[PDB]
C-alpha cells in the first residue's frame, strides 16, 4: 500500500503528478492513493468544451483558473474546500465502487450514521438531495486510475455561477484535513499499511523525474483549449433600429480552437459589407476567444475616417460578438 498527499494547490502540478504515477510506479500488488486540494480552478473532462461550461469572462475577472485533465468525465469546480482522491491501481484490479464505498466508511467514521451513499451514476447523495462527489477515470493497458472529488467546504453558490450544497455546511468539524485523514485511515486499513500519509511537493522533480515539463504542457492553450473537438455556431441577434430591428447573423466553425469558417453577416445599409469582411477575414484562422478591442477598433478607426455613428454601430456589433467569444 501507499498514500500520498500534496502541499501544493496548483492544479496543473497536482495533475502532472497524476500521470507521472500512471505512466510510472508499478501498481501491481502495489496500489496507490493520492489526495490533493487545489486553488479555485475549473476542470473539464478530456473531450469537453471550455466555452460551453464556464463563464470564462466571469472566471477571468476572478483569478479562477481553467484546466483540462487527461481523464474523461464532466466538469466540476475545485477550490480549497474540495478534496481530490485518485485511486491508482492495476487495470486488472480497478473498482470504482470499492472506492466509493471506501469513502463512505471514511465519512461515517467521522459522522456516525450520516445519510450518505453511493448511487447509480457513481456520485454521492447527501440526504438524497445534495450531491457532493464527482467521478472520473482513465484506463491504460496495464493500469487504471479512478479519480474523484469530494465537497467539504467548496462554495456551491460561487460555483453555481459557472454552469453554462456543502459538507461542513452540515457539520463544521468536517474540515477537509479531518476528512483527508478519515479517508487515508480507511485506505490504510483496507490494505493494512502504516496509516502514514507521504506528503509531497509536485514541483520537486528530484522525486519526480522531469515533471514540470508536463505541468507546463497541461497549461498550454494548445492543450487546455486547443483540444476541444470540432464545434460550430449558428446564431443571431437583433439590434434596435429604427425603431424597426436590424438583424445580425453569425456562423463560426471551430477546429482545434482555431476558427475555420467565419461568416458574420450584417445588412449593408446598416454597416458596410467590406467591414464584415475585414472582420470575418481577420478572424479566420484566429484563435477562438475575446478579440483585442484595440485591434478591434484599429480595423477601421484608421481605415474609415471618423463617422461617430459608424464607430457606434461598430461597437454594438463587437459587443454582441465578444458576448460569445
Q: What are phi and psi of 172, to 5 degrees?
A: -40, -50
Domain ranges of the chain: 1-228, 229-325
β-strand pairing of 198-200 with 41-44: unpaired
The radius of gyration of the chain's CA atoms, rounded to the nearest angstrom, is: 24
Q: 69 among the known binding-site residues?
A: no
CATH 3.40.190.80 is right for the domain spanning 229-325: no
**C-alpha cell at position 151:** 465537497
How far is 276 from 267, CA to CA, in rounded Å?
10
Q: 86 among the known binding-site residues?
A: no
CB atoms within 10 A of CB 142: 11
Q: What is the 3-state secondary structure (H, E, C) of 79-92?
A: CCCEEEEEEEEECC
DSSP β-bridge partners for residue 144: 89, 139
Experimental method used, please?
X-ray
How far is 101 from 220, CA to CA, in rounded Å?
36
DSSP 8-state class, residue 25: S
Contact 166, 152 (CB under 8 A): yes
How far is 33 from 299, CA to CA, in rounded Å?
54
DSSP 8-state class, residue 173: T
Helix 293-301 × helix 308-322 angle, to 10° = 150
Q: What b/e sequence results for 83-114 when a residue is b if at least 16 CB atoms lie within 10 Å of its CB, and e otherwise?
A: bbbbbbbbeeebebeebbebbbbbbbbbbeeb
Resolution (A): 3.4
Q: 214 among the known binding-site residues?
A: no
Which residues does a chain break follow in the chain (C to N more than 2.5 Å)? 164
CATH 3.30.930.10 is right for the domain spanning 1-228: yes
DSSP β-bridge partners for residue 66: 42
Contact 179, 152 (CB under 8 A): yes
Report how far Cα 270 is from the mean position of its chain's Cα atoms.
40
How far is 220 from 226, CA to CA, in rounded Å?
9
How far is 194 from 189, CA to CA, in rounded Å?
9
The enclosing H or E element of 320 equals: helix 308-322
Report how far Cα 264 is from the mean position of its chain's Cα atoms.
29
Q: Name residue, grid cell 483569478.
A: 63
Q: 235 among the known binding-site residues?
A: no
Nearest to 188 by CA among 33, 306, 48, 54: 33
Same fold, 1-228 and 229-325: no
Amino acid at each position: 500500500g501507499l498514500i500520498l498527499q500534496s502541499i501544493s494547490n496548483d492544479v496543473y502540478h497536482n495533475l502532472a503528478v497524476e500521470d507521472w504515477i500512471h505512466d510510472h510506479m508499478n501498481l501491481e500488488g502495489k496500489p496507490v492513493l493520492f489526495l490533493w486540494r487545489n486553488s479555485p480552478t475549473v476542470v473539464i473532462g478530456r473531450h469537453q468544451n471550455p466555452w460551453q461550461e464556464c463563464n470564462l469572462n466571469l472566471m477571468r475577472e476572478e483569478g479562477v483558473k481553467l484546466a483540462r485533465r487527461r481523464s474523461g468525465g464532466g466538469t466540476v469546480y475545485h477550490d480549497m474546500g474540495n478534496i481530490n482522491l485518485t485511486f491508482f491501481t492495476t487495470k486488472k484490479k480497478y473498482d470504482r465502487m470499492e472506492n466509493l464505498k471506501l469513502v463512505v466508511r471514511a465519512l461515517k467514521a467521522v459522522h456516525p450514521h450520516l445519510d450518505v451513499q453511493a448511487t447509480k451514476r457513481f456520485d454521492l447523495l447527501l440526504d438524497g438531495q445534495f450531491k457532493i462527489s464527482g467521478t472520473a477515470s482513465k484506463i491504460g493497458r496495464n493500469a487504471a486510475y479512478h479519480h474523484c472529488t469530494l465537497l467539504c467546504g467548496t462554495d456551491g453558490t460561487f460555483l453555481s455561477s459557472l454552469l453554462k450544497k456543502n459538507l461542513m455546511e452540515k457539520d463544521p468539524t468536517l474540515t477537509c484535513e479531518v476528512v483527508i485523514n478519515a479517508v487515508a485511515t480507511e485506505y490504510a486499513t483496507s490494505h493494512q499499511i502504516d496509516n502514514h500519509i507521504h506528503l509531497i511537493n509536485p514541483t520537486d522533480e528530484t522525486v519526480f523525474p522531469g515533471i514540470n515539463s508536463k505541468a507546463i504542457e497541461l497549461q498550454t492553450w494548445e492543450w487546455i483549449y486547443g483540444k476541444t473537438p470540432k464545434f460550430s455556431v449558428d446564431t443571431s441577434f437583433t439590434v434596435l433600429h429604427e425603431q424597426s430591428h436590424v438583424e445580425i447573423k453569425v456562423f463560426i466553425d471551430v477546429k482545434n480552437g482555431r476558427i475555420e469558417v467565419c461568416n458574420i453577416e450584417a445588412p449593408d445599409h446598416w454597416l458596410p459589407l467590406e467591414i464584415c469582411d475585414q472582420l470575418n477575414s481577420s478572424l479566420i484562422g484566429s484563435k477562438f476567444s475575446p478579440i483585442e478591442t484595440t485591434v478591434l477598433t484599429s480595423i477601421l478607426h484608421r481605415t474609415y475616417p471618423g463617422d461617430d455613428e459608424l464607430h457606434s454601430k461598430w461597437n454594438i456589433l463587437c459587443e454582441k460578438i465578444k458576448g460569445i467569444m
